Amino acid sequence: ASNFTQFVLVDNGGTGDVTVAPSNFANGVAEWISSNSRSQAYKVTCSVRQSSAQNRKYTIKVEVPKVATQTVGGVELPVAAWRSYLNMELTIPIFATNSDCELIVKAMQGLLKDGNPIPSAIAANSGIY
Amino acid sequence: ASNFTQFVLVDNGGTGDVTVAPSNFANGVAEWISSNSRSQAYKVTCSVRQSSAQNRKYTIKVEVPKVATQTVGGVELPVAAWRSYLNMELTIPIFATNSDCELIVKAMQGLLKDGNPIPSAIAANSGIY
Amino acid sequence: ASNFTQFVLVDNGGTGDVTVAPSNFANGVAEWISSNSRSQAYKVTCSVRQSSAQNRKYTIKVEVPKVATQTVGGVELPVAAWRSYLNMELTIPIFATNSDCELIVKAMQGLLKDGNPIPSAIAANSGIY
Amino acid sequence: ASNFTQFVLVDNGGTGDVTVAPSNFANGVAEWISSNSRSQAYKVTCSVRQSSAQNRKYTIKVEVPKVATQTVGGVELPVAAWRSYLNMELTIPIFATNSDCELIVKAMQGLLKDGNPIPSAIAANSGIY
Amino acid sequence: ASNFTQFVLVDNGGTGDVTVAPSNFANGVAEWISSNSRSQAYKVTCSVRQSSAQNRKYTIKVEVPKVATQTVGGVELPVAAWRSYLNMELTIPIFATNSDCELIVKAMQGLLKDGNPIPSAIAANSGIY
Amino acid sequence: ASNFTQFVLVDNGGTGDVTVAPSNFANGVAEWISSNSRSQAYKVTCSVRQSSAQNRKYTIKVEVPKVATQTVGGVELPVAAWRSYLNMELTIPIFATNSDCELIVKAMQGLLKDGNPIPSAIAANSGIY
């Protein structure tokens, strides 16, 4: 392998897709950013570490820009009104095989699949009802 | 509507799919568990809260068990050998439009799409490199 | 989806049926109340909690009023002359599958079925003999 | 005449029906037990007492076992892997006529009737939602 | 019944009406919001509780956006310059029948009817004179 | 003008309508009471105050009595068996235009229109569900 490569973060069906590319590897933390100012960029970082004697942990973080009414290349303050932050932590016991790990990835793909409760709630600015 | 519906958490192509159904809404925490003894069930919970004056925060958790049968005191009990835990928090500014919110959902879907860096590392007990 | 809906508590053929409707779900205690004066209403509450490491416990309560009018100083109010209080607690180990729980439910329906010892004793102001 | 007789606790069509038979009536506590090993038997007890000046109170209890075999040192015994414990108390004022008691009984049968909220929650290892 | 449904909050005669739809039910508090960002949304919430031994209380809250000079989807600060808050508390004695309650609703409909003092004062940025 | 005029608080279709008339403006609190002994009258009060440098707050109260005749000391007195109290506060920013204010009035009128969720729950001694 060598998985540290560019990938499509937001798939808008070929036209206006957001591609994110490797931008930093300081300390083993892989970083990927879109082609924007760092204030308006889509950013992804990922690292693994053995959290304890029985677990390995993946720390994945994603920053997404508020796009509606955005001024490209502009200075938009406060920073907090213009950015969403996603923080994921995946704890996996050292006994998990590649197969066990593949199933965990499917559980994550299903949780966020289109039409399911969680992504529908988020996209509609809602909770569960 | 009522977005509090069942969904398939793990899609094993119509056969051995893991579907999860609504099971509790006590204390404002929506819960969904699979059809199993509570000792072996998959569990998904979601709650939203106005974390600050200008934010809303969704807390989502998924538990994927590794089921086993354990002999305790000479008797067999349905049990989970271990569990994998996903904990996610998503903070969204109150200024985010529904289309701004659909953007966050797609980003999360693209992040875990098969073939992309992150779900590839996880499924292979590997880090990003 | 919801099971927090109205239902017929007392079935009197299809007329004079007592229907209890959702009223409040504060702190994990679901409450249902019949219509008209809250003072003469039937009441049902239900909650579940993990009573211990291996047990989940339901606490169900029902109140059946003896509907009456109170006249004091010529001012009459709709009241309940008195009430019966049913308090039940059901402890179920976390090892119980859905099948096991369905059996527990049949055991409860069988206990109270018409003609059986217990519902006959109650219905006739009696004990066992 | 007697109401201290055997009855079907669990009706499974006409076969696999669990029948509970009188066993002991010491100190005002009537007891019923199913056949075979007392260790794997169902148990029902019932008593009535004048709880206070105006109230009579019934204390009914039911135990549903999880039938299993215990093997220790090669010696196997018929045991109950675990048990659910139903404990109910019904308080009825001495002013209740037979008609009033019959209504109380219908209220109890209605609460547990198939399809209603409570028996559905229990049968599915759930709470209210 | 099942009254938790979408309704027209602001009737502008079919064209440009504001519809508000169910968006949250955490803790028994029903919420309805319009299709906007949460900062610019019309929001309604409602809950009932027995406030004391003799009263039931409804807590209804409504948030209305300042529409003149509004930038749809924009970040408008301070939040307080752009929102009106309505807070209603209805205390009803447990003796109130459905009929008594219907009259209370009429008293509320009359108080706010078009052309009456209170709604005229509010709409004209005035007090009473 | 002078918006301090009488109006019909409860419209019972021209017959048994409850009209309320101006009765006091002492201390800047406009008051309106129905044609009854002060012990049995409906009462409506309204006051506006510049609650903050940038807000104005209207405080409105309505009292709906349940009239009765009570025998005190062997003598009959016109009395109110009980009273229902509505307390509303509406905070409006000083930046709100008259059309912004007409928007708040319509929202309040739509909220209580017959058939909508809230006035339906209230009139039925029910919560929202």
Residue E59 burial by Cβ neighbours in a 10 Å radius (0-12, 13-18, 19+): middle
Query: Please, which residues 29-58 of chain B have a Cβ atom closer than 8 Å to chain C?
Result: 35-39
Provide DSSP, F27-38. Answer: GG-EEEE-SS-T
Q: Work out the minimum CA distance from C32 to partner chain E, whole angstroms.
A: 12
Q: Which of B6, B21, B37 sits opposite C96 (nearest CB)?
A: B37
Chain A residues with CB under 8 Å of E73 CB are 68-69
Contact B/F (≥3 CB pairs under 8 Å): no
**Amino acid symbol at D52:** S
Task: Give the nearest chain E residue to C39 (CA atoms).
Answer: E94
Strand order of the β-sheet with B43-52 is A7-10, A18-24, A30-33, A43-49, A55-65, A83-93, B75-93, B55-72, B43-52, B30-33, B18-24, B7-10
Please check whether residue C11 touches B, CB under 8 A: no
Provide DSSP, F37-49. Answer: -TTT--EEEEEEE
Lookup: tokens for B43:
């569990």
What CATH code is carried by the domain that includes residue C108?
A: 3.30.380.10
Q: What are phi and psi of E65, to 5 degrees?
A: -80, 150
Neighbours of chain C (3+ CB pairs under 8 A): B, D, E, F
Q: Which residues contact B72 (CB under 8 A, 6 or more apart)?
A: none
3-state secondary structure (DSSP) of residue E37:
coil
Task: Give the nearest chain B residue to D81 (CA atoms).
Answer: B75
Tell me the count of C-F CB pairs closer than 8 A: 32
Lookup: tokens for D54:
């105006």
Please check whether residue C96 touches B, CB under 8 A: yes
Considering its fold, how many domains does chain D have in total? 1
Please check whether residue D27 touches C, CB under 8 A: no
Instruction: Give CA–CA dist B41/F82, Å, rounded.
Output: 53
User: Which residues lie across from A86 on neighbouring strands?
Assistant: A62, B90
Instruction: Give CA–CA dist A43/A24, Å, rounded.
Output: 11
Instruction: Give CA–CA dist D71/D78, Å, rounded.
Output: 9
- The sign of the dihedral angle between the CA atoms of C117, C121, C127, D3 is negative
Chain C residues with CB under 8 Å of D90 CB are 84-86, 122
Neighbours of chain B (3+ CB pairs under 8 A): A, C, D, E
Pairing type for strands E55-65 and E43-49 reads antiparallel
Please check whether residue B126 touches E, CB under 8 A: no
Per-residue DSSP letter, E94:
T
Q: Which residues contact C16 (CB under 8 A, 6 or more apart)?
A: none
Instruction: Give CA–CA dist F119/F117, Å, rounded.
Output: 6
C57 near C91, Cβ under 8 Å? Answer: yes
Strand stretches in E66-103, DSSP E: 83-93
Lookup: tokens for A107:
């559980």
Q: Residue C80: which domain range?
A: 1-129
Instruction: Give CA–CA dist D10/D65, Å, rounded.
Output: 12
Provide DSSP, chain C. Answer: --S-S-EEEE--TTSS-EEEEEEE-GGG-EEEEESS-GGG--EEEEEEEE-SSSEEEEEEEEEEEEEEEEEETTEEEEEEEEEEEEEEEEEEETT--HHHHHHHHHHHHHHTSTTSHHHHHHHTT----
Q: Which residues contact C1 (CB under 8 A, 6 or more apart)?
A: B2, B4, B5, B6, B21, B22, D129
Instruction: Give CA–CA dist C18/C38, Å, rounded.
Output: 14
3-state secondary structure (DSSP) of residue D90:
strand
- The sign of the dihedral angle between the CA atoms of D108, D114, D115, D121 is positive
Strand order of the β-sheet with F7-10 is E7-10, E18-24, E30-33, E43-49, E55-65, E83-93, F75-93, F55-72, F43-52, F30-33, F18-24, F7-10
> Which run of H or of E encompasses A20?
strand A18-24
Asked if the Cβ–Cβ distance from C74 to F69 is below 8 Å, we say yes
Task: Give the nearest chain A residue to B84 (CA atoms).
Answer: A92
Contact F/D (≥3 CB pairs under 8 Å): no
Please check whether residue F81 touches C, CB under 8 A: yes
Please check whether residue D79 touches C, CB under 8 A: no
Per-residue DSSP letter, F26:
G
Q: Work out the minimum CA distance from B1 to partner chain A, whole angstroms.
A: 9
Q: Which of C4, C28, C95 sits opposite B39 (nearest CB)?
A: C95
